Amino acid sequence: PTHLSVDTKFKTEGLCVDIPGIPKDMTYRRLISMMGFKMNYQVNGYPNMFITREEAIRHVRAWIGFDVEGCHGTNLPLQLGFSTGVNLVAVPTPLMYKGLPWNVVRIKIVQMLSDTLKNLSDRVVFVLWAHGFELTSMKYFVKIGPERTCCLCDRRATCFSTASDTYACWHHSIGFDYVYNPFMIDVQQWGFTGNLQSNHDLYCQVHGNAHVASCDAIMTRCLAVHECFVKRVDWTIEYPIIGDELKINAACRKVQHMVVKAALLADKFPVLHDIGNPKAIKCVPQADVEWKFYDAQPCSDKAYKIEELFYSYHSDKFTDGVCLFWNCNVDRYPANSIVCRFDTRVLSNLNLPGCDGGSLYVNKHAFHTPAFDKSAFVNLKQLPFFYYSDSPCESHGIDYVPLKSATCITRCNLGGAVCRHHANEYRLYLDAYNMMISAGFSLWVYKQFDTYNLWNTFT
Ligand SMILES: CS(=O)(=O)N1CCC(O)CC1
Ligand SMILES: [Zn+2]
Ligand SMILES: [Zn+2]
Numbered sequence: 001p002t003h004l005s006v007d008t009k010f011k012t013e014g015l016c017v018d019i020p021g022i023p024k025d026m027t028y029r030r031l032i033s034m035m036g037f038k039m040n041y042q043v044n045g046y047p048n049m050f051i052t053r054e055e056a057i058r059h060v061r062a063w064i065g066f067d068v069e070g071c072h073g074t075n076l077p078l079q080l081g082f083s084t085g086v087n088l089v090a091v092p093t094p095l096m097y098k099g100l101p102w103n104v105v106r107i108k109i110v111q112m113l114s115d116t117l118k119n120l121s122d123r124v125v126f127v128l129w130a131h132g133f134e135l136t137s138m139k140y141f142v143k144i145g146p147e148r149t150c151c152l153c154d155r156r157a158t159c160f161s162t163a164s165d166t167y168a169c170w171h172h173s174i175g176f177d178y179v180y181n182p183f184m185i186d187v188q189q190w191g192f193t194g195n196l197q198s199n200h201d202l203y204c205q206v207h208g209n210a211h212v213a214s215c216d217a218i219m220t221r222c223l224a225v226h227e228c229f230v231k232r233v234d235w236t237i238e239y240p241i242i243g244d245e246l247k248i249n250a251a252c253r254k255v256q257h258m259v260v261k262a263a264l265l266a267d268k269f270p271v272l273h274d275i276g277n278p279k280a281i282k283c284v285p286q287a288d289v290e291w292k293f294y295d296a297q298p299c300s301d302k303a304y305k306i307e308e309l310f311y312s313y314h315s316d317k318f319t320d321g322v323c324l325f326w327n328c329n330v331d332r333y334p335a336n337s338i339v340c341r342f343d344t345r346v347l348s349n350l351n352l353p354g355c356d357g358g359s360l361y362v363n364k365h366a367f368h369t370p371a372f373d374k375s376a377f378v379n380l381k382q383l384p385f386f387y388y389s390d391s392p393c394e395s396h397g398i399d400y401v402p403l404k405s406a407t408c409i410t411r412c413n414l415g416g417a418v419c420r421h422h423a424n425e426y427r428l429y430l431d432a433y434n435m436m437i438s439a440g441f442s443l444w445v446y447k448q449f450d451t452y453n454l455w456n457t458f459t
């Protein structure tokens with residue numbers, strides 16, 4: 001049990017308006033054959049064009065919503081819509097392009113998929129709400145065969161060129177005309193009542209319906225993300241390293257220890273309420289403070305209501321000391337808080353578009369995150385950058401230009417001149433901090449927080 005058997009039954013009711021007379025009894029084997037593809041009894045890594053829900057979840061970075069609408073089918077032009085917002089018109093002779101033959105349309109499809117996916121995944125998974133025309137249009141831009149490698153590198157082949165008779169990955173496919181060995185999943189097979197729009201709109205008010213193929217492609221991928229990452233959550237699935245994952249996670253741990261340690265020194269809170277990950281560890285283990293933990297898993301649907309986290313009867317007095325919400329998404333933070341909140345609007349290879357304004361954050365694990373909302377932070381202010389250190393001024397063991405900065409809160413800077421060690425540590429921390437902010441994380445703190453209160457910790 002690893003791939004989707006070609007002998008699995010495929011429900012054809014969704015296909016019968018575009019394909020009247022379609023047999024009710026149908027397998028993936030017969031559907032693939034009907035789509036114009038011959039699998040030739042091949043044992044070469046590509047057993048089925050269609051994949052399971054579990055395989056699709058493991059390859060969520062490859063998801064591209066795909067829909068085809070009849071503009072007027074060998075006689076009529078087709079509108080091809082992709083969840084990237086692209087609409088192409090193919091003639092058989094929200095970016096909307098005018099009607100062109102398939103030989104040029106297929107060049108555009110390969111360029112669009114390669115640019116969207118080269119930094120995300122080794123493949124493409126066409127996410128469908130299958131009605132017929134999308135499946136029958138695939139022979140015009142898709143080639144299949146044994147699993148292959150790129151002509152210029154070791155990555156698996158995702159494109160084919162008829163001009164050169166060669167294969168390429170998404171990074172080396174310039175000028176390629178066919179999508180090679182794509183994968184696909186029909187959401188309609190999962191068991192839904194009603195059309196695409198009525199199922200999508202139950203969970204999402206951000207994607208409308210301009211009545212074009214890309215709107216359906218977007219709604220389709222959105223509904224699939226809702227089903228696989230919002231109402232169903234699997235934090236055990238591991239995802240490959242495709243970017244700055246390790247550095248971002250290391251920066252997050254450095255910034256957390258820095259900010260919390262300084263808040264405790266500047267305001268001397270007697271108690272800290274750590275609300276979030278049930279597996280959390282004390283980020284400042286040497287601090288004097290009474291550390292109390294409260295379990296809350298990452299919310300994937302809507303942000304937690306502060307009334308449910310704190311009320312309904314713990315120190316009980318969350319108003320005492322300070323509250324630490326490190327990636328714990330709540331509707332409205334209390335005034336006495338230290339907050340790290342992921343901004344879902346951020347553009348990155350780790351952050352994929354999500355459901356209802358939310359985003360799918362994929363860094364080792366997949367975490368659907370509720371929409372970033374500026375009103376959650378009305379009792380707080382933006383945490384300003386600062387570096388604090390009470391370690392001894394000692395080099396030990398990288399060329400130098402003397403550091404001058406009002407935000408290097410150290411004994412050496414208090415005494416007029418930043419030592420080499422604290423300058424090296426300051427620039428390293430500034431790099432980690434910038435990495436974290438640029439990755440989408442935003443930092444917020446109680447209004448009375450003032451770094452001027454840190455200088456008297458040097459007496
Ligand atoms: C995606 S998020 O909300 O920023 N968050 C951080 C990573 C994980 O440990 C919990 C969820
Ligand atoms: Zn390559
Ligand atoms: Zn949506």
Ligand SMILES: [Zn+2]
Nearest residue numbers: 393412419422
């Ligand atoms: Zn120093």
